[PDB]
């Protein structure tokens, strides 16, 4: 994902975001494995905490305005979409994850092309229908859908 004809700094930022994208994907996949393992085996002690563990790192990157271009250009939002998706048993990620991700989306200059490559629009719509979503986060989702379906 790094651009060969960019200088070291630009490659360094692309790498930072590409590393984060992979770490987010590993964390989501490990939590999914845990929740399938929790189903196949009915072991009730099993909880999915890899996304929650990595969240401060994700929030720190998402909240830096000077990283917006790099975030958007490298499709990090695809990993955000994956973090918001219901899990195999229909359960949502933790409130802290939902709130932190939506608040960060509110500040990013997301364009149609980014929504297209990430699939982020589709998961945000789900948050406006779900019964398990807190009412304040459903309002935030609706407000994002509205900022993204302007004519």
């Amino acid at each position: 994902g790094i651009d060969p004809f960019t200088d070291d700094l630009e490659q360094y930022l692309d790498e930072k975001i590409l590393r984060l994208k992979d770490e987010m994907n590993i964390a989501a996949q490990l939590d999914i494995d845990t929740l399938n393992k929790r189903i196949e085996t009915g072991d009730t002690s099993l909880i999915a905490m890899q996304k929650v563990k990595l969240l401060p790192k994700v929030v720190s990157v998402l909240s830096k305005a000077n990283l917006a271009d790099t975030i958007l250009d490298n499709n990090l939002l695809q990993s955000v979409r994956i973090w918001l998706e219901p899990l195999p048993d229909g359960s949502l990620p933790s409130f802290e994850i939902q709130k932190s991700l939506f608040a960060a989306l509110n500040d990013l200059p997301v364009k149609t092309e980014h929504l297209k490559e990430s699939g982020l629009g589709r998961v945000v719509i789900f948050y406006t229908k779900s019964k398990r979503v807190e009412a304040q986060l459903a309002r935030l989702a609706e407000k994002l859908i509205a900022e993204w379906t302007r004519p």
């Binding site: 229909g90 149609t112 589709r122 719509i125 789900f126 004519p151």
Partner: peptide, 29 residues
Amino acid sequence: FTHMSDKIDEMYDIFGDGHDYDWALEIEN
């Protein structure tokens, strides 16, 4: 306004048909 009709199609490009997650919505119910 010239292509404002096309904006519908663009919604569709972003959102699809809306049913990707019906399985999860049905679980809740």
